A paper describes a structure:
RAS is a major anticancer drug target which requires membrane localization to activate downstream signal transduction. Phosphodiesterase 6δ (PDE6D) has a beta-sandwich immunoglobulin fold which contains a hydrophobic pocket capable of binding to the farnesyl group. PDE6D binds to and sequesters the lipid of cytoplasmic RAS and has been proposed to deliver GTPase to recycling endosomes, which is followed by release mediated by the small G-protein Arf-like 2 (ARL2), allowing RAS to be trafficked back to the plasma membrane. The resultant lipid modification increases the affinity of RAS proteins toward membranes, where it is required for signal transduction. Here, we present a novel strategy for targeting RAS by stabilizing its interaction with the prenyl-binding protein PDE6D and disrupting its localization.
Residue numbers in the entry: -2 to 112, 118 to 150
């Protein structure tokens, strides 16, 4: 039993004012779109799914582009992602956007390098994402991946 702090309140404000507008993945060797979403995969407390083309597992590198809106100002917007296959953490990724202007829309591109078959991976891979503003944890969200 504790206070609902100033940090608890601001983390809640950032979450209620944040939306992921769209996202896509491009083959980094061709610049061509492999997968697009408009579903907000950022939303915590819902068990999200993504159905990506199995040919993605072939790519040496993919670029990921996010477009997001934030009513609240953020000093250092950043993501930590862990990739799980049946509970084993296979990858740990860090991406930094930086300062977010209040009531702004923003585009963010990152590069992911391909560090087992689609038959086995499909439905057994979870990406867990932690959304921070510096050291304030705003949300934790999870996406189960399928290769189709
Ligand atoms: C085994 O699968 C692989 O990852 C290999 N193909 C190597 S790499 C390719 C990239 C992929 C498939 C991972 C893309 C990531 C996804 C679908 C998760 C997107 C989630 C977010 C960007 C988090 C959204 C949350 C916010 C903004 C708070």
């Amino acid at each position: 039993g504790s206070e609902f702090s100033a940090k608890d309140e601001r983390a809640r404000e950032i979450l209620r004012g944040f939306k992921l507008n769209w996202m896509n993945l491009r083959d980094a060797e061709t610049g061509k779109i492999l997968w697009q979403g408009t579903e907000d995969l950022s939303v915590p407390g819902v068990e999200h799914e993504a159905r990506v083309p199995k040919k993605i597992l072939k790519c040496k590198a993919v670029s990921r582009e996010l477009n997001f809106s934030s009513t609240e100002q953020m000093e250092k917007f950043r993501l930590e992602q862990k990739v799980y296959f049946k509970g084993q953490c296979l990858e740990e990724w860090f991406f930094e956007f930086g300062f977010v202007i209040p009531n702004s829309t923003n585009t963010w591109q990152s590069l992911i390098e391909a560090a087992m078959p689609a038959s086995v991976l499909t439905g057994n891979v979870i990406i867990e994402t932690k959304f921070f503003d510096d050291d304030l944890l705003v949300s934790t969200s999870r996406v189960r991946l399928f290769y189709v």
